[PDB]
Amino acid sequence: VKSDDVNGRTKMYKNIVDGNHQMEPGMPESFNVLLKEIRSLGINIELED
Amino acid sequence: KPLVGTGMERAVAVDSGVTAVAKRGGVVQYVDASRIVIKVNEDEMYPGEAGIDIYNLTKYTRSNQNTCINQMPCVSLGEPVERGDVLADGPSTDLGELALGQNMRVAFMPWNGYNFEDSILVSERVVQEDRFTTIHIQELACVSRDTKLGPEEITADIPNVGEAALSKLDESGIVYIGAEVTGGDILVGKVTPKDSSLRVPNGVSGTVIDVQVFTRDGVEKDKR
Amino acid sequence: EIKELLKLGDLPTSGQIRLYDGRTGEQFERPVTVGYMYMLKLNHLVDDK
Amino acid sequence: FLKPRLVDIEQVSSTHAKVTLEPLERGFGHTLGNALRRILLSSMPGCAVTEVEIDGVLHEYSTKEGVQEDILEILLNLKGLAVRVQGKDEVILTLNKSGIGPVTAADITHDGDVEIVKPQHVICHLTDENASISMRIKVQRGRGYVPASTRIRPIGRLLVDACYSPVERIAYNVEAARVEQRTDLDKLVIEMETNGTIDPEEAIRRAATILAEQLEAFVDLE
Amino acid sequence: VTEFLKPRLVDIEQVSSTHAKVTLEPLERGFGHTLGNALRRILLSSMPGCAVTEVEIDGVLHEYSTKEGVQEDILEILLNLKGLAVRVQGKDEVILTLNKSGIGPVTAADITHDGDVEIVKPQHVICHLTDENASISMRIKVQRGRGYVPASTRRLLVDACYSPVERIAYNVEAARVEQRTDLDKLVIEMETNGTIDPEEAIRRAATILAEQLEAFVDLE
Amino acid sequence: ARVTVQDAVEKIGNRFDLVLVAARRARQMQVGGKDPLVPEENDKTTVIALREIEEGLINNQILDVRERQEQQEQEAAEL
Amino acid sequence: MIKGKQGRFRQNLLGKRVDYSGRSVITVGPYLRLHQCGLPKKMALELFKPFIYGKLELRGLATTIKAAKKMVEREEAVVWDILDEVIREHPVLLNRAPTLHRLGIQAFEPVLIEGKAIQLHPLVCAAYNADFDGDQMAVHVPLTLEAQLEARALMMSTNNILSPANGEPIIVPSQDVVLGLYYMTRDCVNAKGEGMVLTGPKEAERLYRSGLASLHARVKVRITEYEKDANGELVAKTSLKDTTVGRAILWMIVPKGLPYSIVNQALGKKAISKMLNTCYRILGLKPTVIFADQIMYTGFAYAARSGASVGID
RNA sequence: UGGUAGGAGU
Ligand SMILES: [Mg+2]
Prior knowledge:
The structure is cut from a larger assembly and holds three copies of chain A, two copies of chain D, one copy of chain F and one copy of chain G.
Chain D lengths: L5 E3 L7 E6 L6 H15 L2 E2 L2 E6 L16 H9 L3 E3 L4 E9 L2 E4 L9 E3 L5 E5 L5 E9 L1 E5 L10 E3 L2 E3 L2 E10 L9 E9 L5 H16 L7
Antiparallel strand pairs in D: 1-2, 2-15, 3-11, 4-10, 4-12, 5-8, 6-10, 7-9, 11-13, 14-15
Chain F lengths: L5 H4 L7 H15 L13 H11 L4 H19 L1
Helix pairs in contact in F: 2-3
Chain G lengths: L7 H6 L7 E8 L7 E5 H7 L1 H11 L5 H9 L3 H10 L5 E5 L8 E9 L4 E3 L4 H4 L7 E5 L4 H11 L20 H9 L12 E2 L2 H10 L7 E13 L2 E12 H6 L18 H15 L2 H21 L7
Parallel strand pairs in G: 1-5, 2-4, 7-8
Antiparallel strand pairs in G: 1-6, 3-4, 3-6, 8-9
Helix pairs in contact in G: 3-4, 3-5, 8-12, 11-12
Bound molecules: magnesium ion.
Magnesium ion binds next to loops of chain G.
Chain G binds one RNA strand through loops.
GO cellular component, one term (chain F): DNA-directed RNA polymerase complex
EC number (chain F): 2.7.7.6
Organism (chain F): Escherichia coli O1:K1 / APEC
């Protein structure tokens, strides 16, 4: 929430000013960047469910 | 000057370029906070086109570490000087001796834990007489870049800002010399076609000593 | 030589003076060293940190 | 309890004075001495300089032509100028001088209510007789130390640090005093070091008045 | 410029009947320390009060000895009498006598009433009598004084404690006001023997200190 | 201005689910319209919930039964 | 750009930079309690900005976010009163540049101070390995309610008494407090007030303060000592003891459970550590924290009063 | 701006 989750960042900032102190975890953007970097070498990365 | 020192401080002070040392001795014809003029003695005075050498002191100028460099005349009017004596004191020198800091009364005792491990407790008298105040010179540069949609101009009128900001600026969009600026205050116009004006960074509050303008050969010159 | 120089002035040879507390006003025991020391101010300012 | 009375205001110099208190019970001497010293070094009315304007200069980091000393050094010299105003809490002092020679504080144009304790104080030196200097000195009444940063308009005005404090060194001793036959009577002498602006006896009276006023906080009137 | 900040009894908290804690509104920088130290010195050094100074017992004639049937040592007897707190009206010198026999603690109320003198805590224990047939006949003499007078400076001699105050501790910590960032808050502790309440002790000390400055404050 | 947690830890020994239950209770106070049980004195919801947990009137089972009562009230208002 | 220290895995995935963080030089504050820490007013204003905005919107001084932002930038009078409410009970995480211990990062309850330096508790600095010589420490603000509860329950300095490496206590009087305690708890062959018999510790303090008796004079003081012989109950034991004035004065701050034998000795650093460990074993945590604060204050005060100094003689 | 060194602090 303080580093990479841009949606988490804006939601946390909006929550704080409203008196709420919740938190949406989300996914860091650094991890997605790493996923794309590894996919760029012909290695298949997938967050399989 | 240090009350107790090794004794070579004079050598390291004169051997650096900070202090102005008289190359030819004589008498001090004219002294001033900006320059010193020495009347050379006849014996040391060359026969052909004999004259008097002029020492121009460098006043407050920014150093590499953003500290002030200034020369203080340590000689009076009419005081004789010889070859090799220091005429002006550079930064952190006193009468030709390397004066790095200040000497003050010191007591070695614990005091209510305020000097716990390496902390130091300083009397308010030290602050009151301004004996540890240091000058700091900063350099802020603005460039009139040639971006698309028309060149960027340095002009006074800044859209969508208060007149108070323009009050400090002159009619040419440059800050007056000697203005007590503070963090965020506009220093130049720097209006871009479409706003982005160079301003004092936050936490900085000091008078503007001088402004230097470099202009490309061929373009017009603003009134400032 | 330092002791002789101190005796040249009107100072104790041991180099320690009895100091009085500033606020309480009661003199400290164990005479405390007092003297003049050359102190420097380093470039590690605090408003820059 | 015997009441202390002030008996001697003996002065050994213009800036040095010793004030003695003859009658004092045992234990009261040190208490009164310490309280008086703290309340004298802490809070006393002063008349230090606050503002200065020089016609030629704009900012205090510049150098005036024909003046031996830098403008910052001139301001630092002015900071130590000791002056007392007996009628007003605000005054404007004008200094005008021309020709070769040191510019002492005696050259300041003076009014009836403004006097200089030590005219020998030097401000700056003029090296060229053609050059001339002019100042407008602004003097205010205050107490404590008020830095120039915490003031809360024109370019010409130069701000100096203000330290309104006439006293700079207070020392006291408690000695045995012989009154009639009873012993334990103590004599308290207080040695003062002012800049000449504030009288010693008046300083003691003001300090004791402040101490008595502050004592009324946790006690009913007495 | 002569105006100064004035606190008004921001908190006078009573831990018990004989113990209190006093707090003050923001004081100017450095006034907390001087006020606290002045009150401390006045209370510990110069406060009128009455206490036992010497005691004569017919049973024991030496400082170190033994009394039959008394589990308390002779030294402990002096401490118990010294801890006794008594207030006397008018007369500056009065002698108190106490005789008792039988098993049971010799409480403070056991002493003869002796008219004007009052004992703050009658439950105070002086000594214990182990034997029913054992008896104690002791005579104490008290007088009004000022401050603590040790026995060394001074027939059994017991160091007197004239001042009603047992413990004084002043603490100063920073306080915040909108106009002035650096100010002082004075916290004064109090431990009196019970004859005079802590608030009255502080009032009397302040009155003494302000009375000592009457001559200085002239035409003010 | 609570300084210790040990007394509240004695109620819930793990001291790890203490954080969870106290966070749930404080979320109930500060997000919903729920008013604290223990009297409040210009304190943050953190310390208010911790002081309730200390007094023994708040537990995981107590919160569960309270939530069940609120669920029953909500379903009752439906019909 | 994947492998190595400069790669994503080490630099960005495990080393994310965090908002709501600040850095400043540290300095010692002896006024602080164990759980507190200094914090500059400007640093606190910058870190807690969204909370200030929310409080301004709730109170109603600022209608919109832009108005609140302008008001905060103006640092008006009302902003400081709002700030005092926000940071009233909000812990802040403090850590040193090298973080070796689990205790390298700890949570404190902040107090607003003037200046640009973070005031740190003297006893805490032992675990941080701080030296107060240009040392720097970064602060972090836990935002979410779970994070605040978590910091209060686990990371607060009052909780970290014993190091995880070994059972020995991690807070201990170190440099000046131990010197003051050693100076106070010492005996001189001949001193002012020797041979006196005193009623109790309060009398010893009164005698030392008035100057009638020295801090090292051997005397006989009646001491009320409590021993928990019964399970959960304390029985008082009063007796005359041959101790100095300084030991009697120090006995006042000692809790009820501890015996008197600990104070009677010379009280070196090992003795102080043993006394703190004994308090932790017997009376739990809260009395140990109060005792540590009292020990630090008393040691600092009496070390200052001692006037110990080093000289060439 | 961003990548490199360069020196320094703990
Ligand atoms: Mg360090």
